[PDB]
C-alpha cells in the first residue's frame, strides 16, 4: 500500500464562444480550441 | 438548456416573428390603398360617354 489518499481534479470544458460560433452557424467545421490553432496558423508562415 | 445554441434558436424565431408581423402591418397599409381604387371604379363611367 502506498497510501489510502488521492488527489483528483475537477472538470474541464469547452463552450462555443469566440469564433467557434461563426464557424458553426456560417461555416460547418467547428475546430476544438480554434483560436490557439488559428493564431498559430497565422504564426507558422513567418516562422 | 442554458446554452448558446438555445439563445440563437430563441432569437431566430423572433427575427422571423418581427419580420412576419411587419408584413401584415404593411398589409393593411397596402390593402387600404388597394381598396381605395375599387369603389372609385364602381362609379366613374368612362370619358367618352
mmCIF file of N, CA and C in Angstrom:
data_model
loop_
_atom_site.group_PDB
_atom_site.id
_atom_site.type_symbol
_atom_site.label_atom_id
_atom_site.label_comp_id
_atom_site.label_asym_id
_atom_site.label_seq_id
_atom_site.Cartn_x
_atom_site.Cartn_y
_atom_site.Cartn_z
ATOM 1 N N UNK A 1 0.833 -1.197 0.000
ATOM 2 C CA UNK A 1 0.000 0.000 0.000
ATOM 3 C C UNK A 1 0.864 1.243 0.000
ATOM 4 N N UNK A 2 0.695 2.071 -1.031
ATOM 5 C CA UNK A 2 1.260 3.411 -0.976
ATOM 6 C C UNK A 2 0.599 4.233 0.119
ATOM 7 N N UNK A 3 -0.676 4.584 -0.059
ATOM 8 C CA UNK A 3 -1.487 5.189 0.991
ATOM 9 C C UNK A 3 -2.903 4.676 0.840
ATOM 10 N N UNK A 4 -3.821 5.377 1.489
ATOM 11 C CA UNK A 4 -5.199 5.453 1.040
ATOM 12 C C UNK A 4 -5.565 6.936 1.003
ATOM 13 N N UNK A 5 -5.144 7.615 -0.062
ATOM 14 C CA UNK A 5 -5.281 9.059 -0.186
ATOM 15 C C UNK A 5 -5.052 9.434 -1.640
ATOM 16 N N UNK A 6 -5.941 10.264 -2.166
ATOM 17 C CA UNK A 6 -5.958 10.527 -3.596
ATOM 18 C C UNK A 6 -6.205 12.010 -3.822
ATOM 19 N N UNK A 7 -5.561 12.549 -4.856
ATOM 20 C CA UNK A 7 -5.723 13.950 -5.241
ATOM 21 C C UNK A 7 -6.263 14.007 -6.668
ATOM 22 N N UNK A 8 -7.569 13.889 -6.892
ATOM 23 C CA UNK A 8 -8.072 14.069 -8.258
ATOM 24 C C UNK A 8 -8.229 15.527 -8.619
ATOM 25 N N UNK A 9 -8.819 15.770 -9.782
ATOM 26 C CA UNK A 9 -9.038 17.119 -10.276
ATOM 27 C C UNK A 9 -10.529 17.327 -10.492
ATOM 28 N N UNK A 10 -10.906 18.512 -10.964
ATOM 29 C CA UNK A 10 -12.289 18.861 -11.265
ATOM 30 C C UNK A 10 -12.413 18.889 -12.794
ATOM 31 N N UNK A 11 -13.603 19.223 -13.316
ATOM 32 C CA UNK A 11 -13.905 19.029 -14.734
ATOM 33 C C UNK A 11 -13.099 19.953 -15.631
ATOM 34 N N UNK A 12 -13.084 19.603 -16.918
ATOM 35 C CA UNK A 12 -12.729 20.527 -17.970
ATOM 36 C C UNK A 12 -13.909 20.770 -18.888
ATOM 37 N N UNK A 13 -13.742 21.729 -19.799
ATOM 38 C CA UNK A 13 -14.860 22.135 -20.636
ATOM 39 C C UNK A 13 -14.376 22.884 -21.862
ATOM 40 N N UNK A 14 -15.273 23.010 -22.837
ATOM 41 C CA UNK A 14 -15.132 23.949 -23.942
ATOM 42 C C UNK A 14 -16.518 24.362 -24.414
ATOM 43 N N UNK A 15 -16.747 25.671 -24.501
ATOM 44 C CA UNK A 15 -18.028 26.238 -24.902
ATOM 45 C C UNK A 15 -17.779 27.121 -26.117
ATOM 46 N N UNK A 16 -18.722 27.108 -27.063
ATOM 47 C CA UNK A 16 -18.585 27.813 -28.334
ATOM 48 C C UNK A 16 -18.658 29.312 -28.082
ATOM 49 N N UNK A 17 -17.502 29.964 -27.944
ATOM 50 C CA UNK A 17 -17.543 31.362 -27.544
ATOM 51 C C UNK A 17 -16.973 32.325 -28.578
ATOM 52 N N UNK A 18 -15.699 32.171 -28.919
ATOM 53 C CA UNK A 18 -15.006 33.222 -29.637
ATOM 54 C C UNK A 18 -15.314 33.323 -31.112
ATOM 55 N N UNK A 19 -14.865 32.339 -31.876
ATOM 56 C CA UNK A 19 -15.153 32.256 -33.294
ATOM 57 C C UNK A 19 -15.766 30.926 -33.663
ATOM 58 N N UNK A 20 -15.814 29.990 -32.706
ATOM 59 C CA UNK A 20 -16.439 28.686 -32.900
ATOM 60 C C UNK A 20 -17.903 28.809 -33.285
ATOM 61 N N UNK A 21 -18.575 29.842 -32.777
ATOM 62 C CA UNK A 21 -19.934 30.188 -33.167
ATOM 63 C C UNK A 21 -20.014 30.444 -34.661
ATOM 64 N N UNK A 22 -19.172 31.358 -35.139
ATOM 65 C CA UNK A 22 -19.178 31.828 -36.518
ATOM 66 C C UNK A 22 -18.807 30.681 -37.448
ATOM 67 N N UNK A 23 -17.944 29.782 -36.974
ATOM 68 C CA UNK A 23 -17.564 28.638 -37.795
ATOM 69 C C UNK A 23 -18.610 27.534 -37.759
ATOM 70 N N UNK A 24 -19.662 27.694 -36.959
ATOM 71 C CA UNK A 24 -20.683 26.658 -36.884
ATOM 72 C C UNK A 24 -21.978 27.110 -37.542
ATOM 73 N N UNK A 25 -22.322 28.379 -37.391
ATOM 74 C CA UNK A 25 -23.570 28.861 -37.951
ATOM 75 C C UNK A 25 -23.388 29.537 -39.297
ATOM 76 N N UNK A 26 -22.153 29.707 -39.758
ATOM 77 C CA UNK A 26 -21.903 30.161 -41.121
ATOM 78 C C UNK A 26 -21.108 29.092 -41.853
ATOM 79 N N UNK A 27 -19.999 28.680 -41.256
ATOM 80 C CA UNK A 27 -19.284 27.531 -41.768
ATOM 81 C C UNK A 27 -19.855 26.272 -41.131
ATOM 82 N N UNK A 28 -19.339 25.124 -41.551
ATOM 83 C CA UNK A 28 -19.785 23.881 -40.953
ATOM 84 C C UNK A 28 -18.796 23.334 -39.947
ATOM 85 N N UNK A 29 -17.501 23.493 -40.221
ATOM 86 C CA UNK A 29 -16.468 22.892 -39.397
ATOM 87 C C UNK A 29 -16.218 23.768 -38.176
ATOM 88 N N UNK A 30 -16.279 23.144 -37.001
ATOM 89 C CA UNK A 30 -16.024 23.880 -35.771
ATOM 90 C C UNK A 30 -14.846 23.284 -35.018
ATOM 91 N N UNK A 31 -13.682 23.915 -35.122
ATOM 92 C CA UNK A 31 -12.454 23.387 -34.541
ATOM 93 C C UNK A 31 -12.452 23.541 -33.026
ATOM 94 N N UNK A 32 -12.290 22.425 -32.319
ATOM 95 C CA UNK A 32 -11.979 22.456 -30.899
ATOM 96 C C UNK A 32 -10.651 23.157 -30.654
ATOM 97 N N UNK A 33 -10.679 24.137 -29.744
ATOM 98 C CA UNK A 33 -9.555 25.025 -29.427
ATOM 99 C C UNK A 33 -9.035 25.724 -30.687
ATOM 100 N N UNK A 34 -9.965 26.413 -31.354
ATOM 101 C CA UNK A 34 -9.712 27.057 -32.638
ATOM 102 C C UNK A 34 -8.677 28.164 -32.537
ATOM 103 N N UNK A 35 -8.837 29.048 -31.554
ATOM 104 C CA UNK A 35 -8.113 30.312 -31.565
ATOM 105 C C UNK A 35 -6.640 30.111 -31.256
ATOM 106 N N UNK A 36 -6.317 29.084 -30.477
ATOM 107 C CA UNK A 36 -4.912 28.761 -30.282
ATOM 108 C C UNK A 36 -4.322 28.150 -31.543
ATOM 109 N N UNK A 37 -5.144 27.454 -32.324
ATOM 110 C CA UNK A 37 -4.676 26.965 -33.616
ATOM 111 C C UNK A 37 -4.708 28.091 -34.637
ATOM 112 N N UNK A 38 -5.753 28.916 -34.580
ATOM 113 C CA UNK A 38 -5.959 29.927 -35.603
ATOM 114 C C UNK A 38 -4.905 31.017 -35.578
ATOM 115 N N UNK A 39 -4.420 31.360 -34.386
ATOM 116 C CA UNK A 39 -3.278 32.262 -34.301
ATOM 117 C C UNK A 39 -2.035 31.598 -34.856
ATOM 118 N N UNK A 40 -1.814 30.340 -34.488
ATOM 119 C CA UNK A 40 -0.571 29.686 -34.859
ATOM 120 C C UNK A 40 -0.566 29.322 -36.333
ATOM 121 N N UNK A 41 -1.746 29.262 -36.954
ATOM 122 C CA UNK A 41 -1.811 29.202 -38.410
ATOM 123 C C UNK A 41 -1.444 30.538 -39.038
ATOM 124 N N UNK A 42 -1.530 31.622 -38.271
ATOM 125 C CA UNK A 42 -1.006 32.886 -38.755
ATOM 126 C C UNK A 42 0.406 33.131 -38.255
ATOM 127 N N UNK A 43 0.973 32.185 -37.514
ATOM 128 C CA UNK A 43 2.310 32.328 -36.965
ATOM 129 C C UNK A 43 3.356 31.507 -37.700
ATOM 130 N N UNK A 44 2.998 30.331 -38.208
ATOM 131 C CA UNK A 44 3.983 29.442 -38.807
ATOM 132 C C UNK A 44 4.553 29.964 -40.115
ATOM 133 N N UNK A 45 3.781 30.717 -40.895
ATOM 134 C CA UNK A 45 4.242 31.137 -42.211
ATOM 135 C C UNK A 45 5.307 32.222 -42.154
ATOM 136 N N UNK A 46 5.513 32.861 -41.005
ATOM 137 C CA UNK A 46 6.682 33.706 -40.816
ATOM 138 C C UNK A 46 7.730 33.060 -39.922
ATOM 139 N N UNK A 47 7.405 31.922 -39.300
ATOM 140 C CA UNK A 47 8.323 31.085 -38.509
ATOM 141 C C UNK A 47 9.052 31.819 -37.387
ATOM 142 N N UNK B 1 -31.796 25.187 -22.652
ATOM 143 C CA UNK B 1 -30.813 24.406 -21.918
ATOM 144 C C UNK B 1 -29.691 25.265 -21.364
ATOM 145 N N UNK B 2 -29.852 26.586 -21.373
ATOM 146 C CA UNK B 2 -28.812 27.481 -20.931
ATOM 147 C C UNK B 2 -27.596 27.532 -21.823
ATOM 148 N N UNK B 3 -27.708 27.102 -23.073
ATOM 149 C CA UNK B 3 -26.559 27.097 -23.960
ATOM 150 C C UNK B 3 -26.725 28.135 -25.055
ATOM 151 N N UNK B 4 -25.605 28.470 -25.688
ATOM 152 C CA UNK B 4 -25.629 29.444 -26.762
ATOM 153 C C UNK B 4 -26.338 28.946 -28.003
ATOM 154 N N UNK B 5 -26.497 27.629 -28.129
ATOM 155 C CA UNK B 5 -27.325 27.082 -29.194
ATOM 156 C C UNK B 5 -28.770 27.508 -28.985
ATOM 157 N N UNK B 6 -29.200 27.580 -27.726
ATOM 158 C CA UNK B 6 -30.599 27.850 -27.438
ATOM 159 C C UNK B 6 -30.956 29.302 -27.715
ATOM 160 N N UNK B 7 -30.086 30.234 -27.320
ATOM 161 C CA UNK B 7 -30.414 31.645 -27.464
ATOM 162 C C UNK B 7 -30.375 32.089 -28.916
ATOM 163 N N UNK B 8 -29.485 31.500 -29.720
ATOM 164 C CA UNK B 8 -29.568 31.698 -31.164
ATOM 165 C C UNK B 8 -30.878 31.174 -31.707
ATOM 166 N N UNK B 9 -31.308 30.003 -31.236
ATOM 167 C CA UNK B 9 -32.573 29.453 -31.699
ATOM 168 C C UNK B 9 -33.743 30.296 -31.222
ATOM 169 N N UNK B 10 -33.660 30.809 -29.997
ATOM 170 C CA UNK B 10 -34.730 31.653 -29.487
ATOM 171 C C UNK B 10 -34.811 32.950 -30.268
ATOM 172 N N UNK B 11 -33.662 33.492 -30.645
ATOM 173 C CA UNK B 11 -33.680 34.800 -31.276
ATOM 174 C C UNK B 11 -34.105 34.687 -32.735
ATOM 175 N N UNK B 12 -33.876 33.518 -33.343
ATOM 176 C CA UNK B 12 -34.244 33.317 -34.743
ATOM 177 C C UNK B 12 -35.751 33.351 -34.945
ATOM 178 N N UNK B 13 -36.503 32.784 -34.003
ATOM 179 C CA UNK B 13 -37.956 32.760 -34.131
ATOM 180 C C UNK B 13 -38.531 34.167 -34.029
ATOM 181 N N UNK B 14 -37.927 34.993 -33.178
ATOM 182 C CA UNK B 14 -38.356 36.381 -33.054
ATOM 183 C C UNK B 14 -37.934 37.190 -34.276
ATOM 184 N N UNK B 15 -36.754 36.896 -34.828
ATOM 185 C CA UNK B 15 -36.331 37.532 -36.075
ATOM 186 C C UNK B 15 -37.120 37.028 -37.278
ATOM 187 N N UNK B 16 -37.912 35.975 -37.096
ATOM 188 C CA UNK B 16 -38.948 35.682 -38.074
ATOM 189 C C UNK B 16 -40.250 36.381 -37.720
ATOM 190 N N UNK B 17 -40.641 36.321 -36.445
ATOM 191 C CA UNK B 17 -41.916 36.853 -35.980
ATOM 192 C C UNK B 17 -42.032 38.351 -36.200
ATOM 193 N N UNK B 18 -40.964 39.083 -35.878
ATOM 194 C CA UNK B 18 -40.931 40.512 -36.153
ATOM 195 C C UNK B 18 -40.963 40.762 -37.649
ATOM 196 N N UNK B 19 -40.269 39.914 -38.402
ATOM 197 C CA UNK B 19 -40.296 40.002 -39.851
ATOM 198 C C UNK B 19 -41.648 39.539 -40.380
ATOM 199 N N UNK B 20 -42.313 38.642 -39.648
ATOM 200 C CA UNK B 20 -43.675 38.276 -40.017
ATOM 201 C C UNK B 20 -44.673 39.377 -39.687
ATOM 202 N N UNK B 21 -44.571 39.973 -38.499
ATOM 203 C CA UNK B 21 -45.611 40.905 -38.068
ATOM 204 C C UNK B 21 -45.483 42.225 -38.817
ATOM 205 N N UNK B 22 -44.286 42.524 -39.316
ATOM 206 C CA UNK B 22 -44.106 43.746 -40.085
ATOM 207 C C UNK B 22 -44.746 43.604 -41.456
ATOM 208 N N UNK B 23 -44.936 42.365 -41.907
ATOM 209 C CA UNK B 23 -45.579 42.126 -43.189
ATOM 210 C C UNK B 23 -47.066 42.455 -43.122
ATOM 211 N N UNK B 24 -47.758 41.947 -42.104
ATOM 212 C CA UNK B 24 -49.198 42.175 -42.017
ATOM 213 C C UNK B 24 -49.497 43.603 -41.585
ATOM 214 N N UNK B 25 -48.549 44.236 -40.896
ATOM 215 C CA UNK B 25 -48.718 45.646 -40.575
ATOM 216 C C UNK B 25 -48.638 46.498 -41.829
ATOM 217 N N UNK B 26 -47.764 46.122 -42.754
ATOM 218 C CA UNK B 26 -47.731 46.812 -44.029
ATOM 219 C C UNK B 26 -48.868 46.394 -44.935
ATOM 220 N N UNK B 27 -49.536 45.296 -44.593
ATOM 221 C CA UNK B 27 -50.536 44.730 -45.487
ATOM 222 C C UNK B 27 -51.796 45.578 -45.514
ATOM 223 N N UNK B 28 -52.296 45.945 -44.338
ATOM 224 C CA UNK B 28 -53.466 46.807 -44.293
ATOM 225 C C UNK B 28 -53.116 48.214 -44.738
ATOM 226 N N UNK B 29 -51.846 48.595 -44.604
ATOM 227 C CA UNK B 29 -51.378 49.836 -45.207
ATOM 228 C C UNK B 29 -51.424 49.739 -46.723
ATOM 229 N N UNK B 30 -51.005 48.600 -47.267
ATOM 230 C CA UNK B 30 -51.164 48.379 -48.697
ATOM 231 C C UNK B 30 -52.622 48.159 -49.064
ATOM 232 N N UNK B 31 -53.310 47.294 -48.321
ATOM 233 C CA UNK B 31 -54.643 46.842 -48.682
ATOM 234 C C UNK B 31 -55.717 47.905 -48.671
ATOM 235 N N UNK B 32 -55.558 48.891 -47.789
ATOM 236 C CA UNK B 32 -56.417 50.064 -47.821
ATOM 237 C C UNK B 32 -56.295 50.775 -49.157
ATOM 238 N N UNK B 33 -55.056 51.051 -49.575
ATOM 239 C CA UNK B 33 -54.747 51.681 -50.852
ATOM 240 C C UNK B 33 -55.242 50.846 -52.021
ATOM 241 N N UNK B 34 -55.189 49.523 -51.867
ATOM 242 C CA UNK B 34 -55.796 48.637 -52.850
ATOM 243 C C UNK B 34 -57.297 48.868 -52.910
ATOM 244 N N UNK B 35 -57.918 49.050 -51.752
ATOM 245 C CA UNK B 35 -59.364 49.171 -51.706
ATOM 246 C C UNK B 35 -59.791 50.565 -52.128
ATOM 247 N N UNK B 36 -58.847 51.504 -52.079
ATOM 248 C CA UNK B 36 -59.095 52.892 -52.457
ATOM 249 C C UNK B 36 -59.547 53.019 -53.905
ATOM 250 N N UNK B 37 -59.072 52.129 -54.769
ATOM 251 C CA UNK B 37 -59.374 52.285 -56.185
ATOM 252 C C UNK B 37 -60.663 51.586 -56.570
ATOM 253 N N UNK B 38 -61.074 50.576 -55.802
ATOM 254 C CA UNK B 38 -62.177 49.721 -56.229
ATOM 255 C C UNK B 38 -63.510 50.448 -56.182
ATOM 256 N N UNK B 39 -63.747 51.244 -55.140
ATOM 257 C CA UNK B 39 -65.033 51.930 -55.100
ATOM 258 C C UNK B 39 -65.006 53.143 -56.004
ATOM 259 N N UNK B 40 -63.816 53.585 -56.403
ATOM 260 C CA UNK B 40 -63.746 54.690 -57.339
ATOM 261 C C UNK B 40 -64.041 54.206 -58.753
ATOM 262 N N UNK B 41 -63.898 52.900 -58.987
ATOM 263 C CA UNK B 41 -64.220 52.346 -60.297
ATOM 264 C C UNK B 41 -65.592 51.690 -60.323
ATOM 265 N N UNK B 42 -66.203 51.468 -59.158
ATOM 266 C CA UNK B 42 -67.606 51.073 -59.153
ATOM 267 C C UNK B 42 -68.466 52.206 -59.687
ATOM 268 N N UNK B 43 -68.043 53.435 -59.436
ATOM 269 C CA UNK B 43 -68.532 54.642 -60.077
ATOM 270 C C UNK B 43 -67.681 54.962 -61.295
ATOM 271 N N UNK B 44 -67.767 56.229 -61.726
ATOM 272 C CA UNK B 44 -66.930 56.867 -62.737
ATOM 273 C C UNK B 44 -67.063 56.232 -64.115
ATOM 274 N N UNK B 45 -68.159 56.475 -64.830
ATOM 275 C CA UNK B 45 -68.280 55.989 -66.205
ATOM 276 C C UNK B 45 -67.237 56.638 -67.095
ATOM 277 N N UNK B 46 -66.820 55.964 -68.170
ATOM 278 C CA UNK B 46 -65.672 56.442 -68.949
ATOM 279 C C UNK B 46 -65.913 57.759 -69.674
ATOM 280 N N UNK B 47 -64.805 58.363 -70.099
ATOM 281 C CA UNK B 47 -64.733 59.746 -70.556
ATOM 282 C C UNK B 47 -65.575 59.995 -71.793
ATOM 283 N N UNK B 48 -65.643 58.990 -72.664
ATOM 284 C CA UNK B 48 -66.242 59.156 -73.980
ATOM 285 C C UNK B 48 -67.739 59.407 -73.887
ATOM 286 N N UNK B 49 -68.436 58.644 -73.047
ATOM 287 C CA UNK B 49 -69.874 58.843 -72.982
ATOM 288 C C UNK B 49 -70.220 59.857 -71.903
#
